[PDB]
Amino acid sequence: MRSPGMADQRQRSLSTSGESLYHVLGLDKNATSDDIKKSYRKLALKYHPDKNPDNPEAADKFKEINNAHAILTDATKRNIYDKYGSLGLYVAEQFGEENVNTYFV
């Protein structure tokens, strides 16, 4: 059931489900709002900005935690994430889901 101390094996590419947000929180697509929120908190302080060196990796982490926190439990951010994800997701975050239509058609 996933023992702490996990190391990425050679089969890293197949171990990854292809989904990003879910896995930043250490959960799969089988999580519910409850799992997503708590995993946010648990990681949010762990990767809290002050815990970060010059490498923005941990900032990228906090970003994806804080992002997934909304995305997976949000019907829309999850919607376009599965639909297209590349543009619609990023733009809904920066511009706003209803707003994106400005950058879209």
Q: How was this structure determined?
A: NMR
CA–CA separation, 31 and 27 (whole Å): 6
How far is 52 from 60, CA to CA, in rounded Å? 10
Cβ density class 3-36: b for 16+ within 10 Å, e for less: eeeeeeeeeeeeeeeebebbbbbebeeebeeebb
Dist. CA 29–CA 51, nearest whole Å: 28
For residue 104, what are its two tokens?
Answer: 């879209």
Instruction: Report the candidate in 56, 57, 68 with the shortest Cα–Cα distance to residue 24.
Output: 68
Q: Which domains does the chain have, with CATH numbers?
A: 1-105 (1.10.287.110)
In this structure, what are the phi and psi dihedrals at residue 80, rounded to the nearest 5 degrees? -70, -30
Q: What is the distance between the alpha carbons of residues 89 and 100, in angstroms, rounded to a whole number?
A: 9
Do residues 91 and 100 make contact, with C-beta atoms less than 8 angstroms apart?
yes
Amino acid at 80: I
Q: Tell me how far CA of residue 3 lies from CA of 7, 50, 56, 92, in angstroms.
A: 10, 28, 28, 36
- CA 12 to CA 4: how far, in whole Å? 17
Greatest pairwise CA separation for the chain in angstroms: 47
| The residue to which tokens 């879209």 are assigned | 104
